[PDB]
Design a protein around this ligand. Structure first.
Ligand code: PLM
Length: 277
């Protein structure tokens, strides 16, 4: 019944969205004078992005435009279809607010139409997992309202711990001895980015991230994301799966919009606690 829409910052694999009937509106990357798509056959990849960033290219990102949500929303209302939009955190992008404005314009044309927008206060794998729980609820025949309620319950309980090389691109992007120091960050209850530890070295950074992620597990699945290093993510995966509470691990490469902000060698772990973080 209801359609599920998300955005390219949820970092869902194309194969998953195709097979799961989830649509994705692309944010853009501005990279050395050109605007790249982040969805479609011509989408910019993180591998290409990070390569350019290593040679000194300072790429910036842009929100989804009101027009994109307009078209999608209007097409759905025209077709008698309900819509759930699992949205990239409102505190990191004006994407959510543009969708809200687009919904306003469409409800003018289609006053009885059904369009729910969830401000996940999330990012990348976290956001993606929320969409995955939303596609699972849809399978189980939950309504749009019930699915909205599920995501609004789960979202505040999602933990996001992420380990970076430094704060350079994070501070450069506007959303935020140091030799061999790996900062560890999280998203607080407001969805704000907040350093919580500075580890001497990647092995310690990972250990700490694993410890914090596994402090409070109330759900059998964890998510690991990585910028560059797929073997490092595998090591996180194995460790996670060694918790009796963790039965599954979803592993997702970071997409280029997120990668533009966090930088290379980023690792992240997403888990769901019993209570709201
Ligand atoms: C693995 C990293 C975890 C992600 C948690 C948040 C990381 C900060 C990323 C900021 C992304 C901001 C993208 C802004 C898009 C836009 O231009 O509107």
């Amino acid at each position: 019944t209801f359609k599920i829409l998300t955005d390219s910052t949820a970092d869902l694999p194309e194969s998953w969205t195709q097979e799961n009937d989830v649509q994705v509106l692309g944010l853009t990357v501005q990279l050395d004078g050109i605007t790249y798509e982040t969805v479609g056959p011509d989408r910019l990849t993180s591998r290409v992005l990070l390569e350019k960033i290593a040679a000194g290219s300072k790429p910036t990102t842009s929100q989804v435009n009101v027009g994109q949500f307009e078209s999608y929303f209007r097409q759905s209302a025209e077709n008698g279809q309900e819509v759930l939009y699992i949205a990239f955190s409102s505190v990191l992008s004006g994407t959510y607010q543009s969708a809200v404005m687009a919904r306003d314009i469409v409800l003018e044309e289609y006053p009885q139409a059904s369009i729910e927008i969830v401000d996940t206060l999330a990012a990348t794998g976290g956001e993606g997992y929320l969409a995955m729980l939303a596609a699972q609820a849809r399978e189980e025949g939950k309504s749009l309202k019930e699915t909205k309620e599920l995501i609004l319950d789960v979202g505040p309980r999602l933990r996001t711990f992420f380990l970076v090389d430094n704060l350079y691109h994070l501070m450069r992007g506007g959303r935020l001895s140091l030799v061999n120091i790996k900062p560890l960050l999280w998203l607080d209850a407001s969805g704000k980015l907040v350093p919580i530890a500075k580890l001497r070295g990647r092995k310690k950074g990972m250990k700490e991230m694993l410890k914090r992620a596994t402090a409070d597990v109330a759900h059998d699945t964890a998510v690991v994301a990585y910028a560059n290093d797929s073997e490092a993510a595998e090591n996180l995966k194995e460790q996670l799966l060694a918790n009796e509470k963790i039965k599954n691990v979803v592993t997702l490469p970071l997409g280029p919009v997120i990668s533009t902000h966090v930088g290379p060698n980023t690792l992240a772990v997403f888990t769901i606690g019993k209570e709201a973080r």
